[model samples]
Target: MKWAYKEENNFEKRRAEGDKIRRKYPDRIPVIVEKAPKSKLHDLDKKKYLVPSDLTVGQFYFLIRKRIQLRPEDALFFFVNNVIPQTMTTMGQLYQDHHEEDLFLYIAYSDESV
Candidate 1:
């Protein structure tokens, strides 16, 4: 999607914020996880997670599933700004693209594998 100038500015601000945090804690990056209103996983909505910047979307899903105590057979889907992210996408890339000025990379997930 085409982002506006304000969004770009916000992204830059978030990147700077992340940089500051990284200087103090080098092992993890902060992110926010929200359940979509229409999602079946809403019961497990968690606002924050400290994840490795190098982690892939595939790996992130497993962590989320574990935290929510979801069964292995349950399907899961993730989105960044309503757009599905590729499984191989790195958390760092996700942060640069979707993080807000608060340095929280907001991610949404659903039980439907759409």
Candidate 2:
């Protein structure tokens, strides 16, 4: 499947921007995960993480699952301000939209369905 010129150009632009951010913040962006009320998932002793700003929401899901040591059968979900983000959503975008002065992206987790 060949990407059209416009689509390819847009992808390159995003990639270059992500590279620039990575160079400026080599340690990555910090994020804090909070458990949604009444969630049955296990609590994370380490709720804070420094992750690549370019990471997509889909990648974040797997990252969280690994960090929490959940079994394959276990389900996980994430939200910001009670809204579920799309898989293509970038971590940097979330930070810009929802973070406070501390630059920590706040995310709520749950095992429940939306």
Candidate with best lDDT: 1
Per-residue alpha-carbon lDDT of candidate 2 for residues 48-95, written as tens digits (9 for 90 to 100):
567877898889888888877886688777888778888899887887
How many clashes does each candidate structure show, in the order listed?
0, 0
- The number of the candidate with the highest TM-score is 1
Where does candidate 1 have its weakest 10-residue lDDT segment?
1-10
Per-residue error for 84 in candidate 1, Å, reads 0.8
Write candidate 1's Cα lDDT for 1-114 as tens digits.
232333445667767766787677665767767665656564554565788889999899888888888877987888787789998998888887887766667777787655
lDDT of 1: 0.73
Q: State residue 70's C-alpha deviation in candidate 1, in Å.
A: 1.7
TM-score per prediction, in order, is 0.71, 0.69
Which residue pairs in candidate 1 have backbone atoms (N, alpha carbon, C) closer than 3 angstroms, thus clashing? none
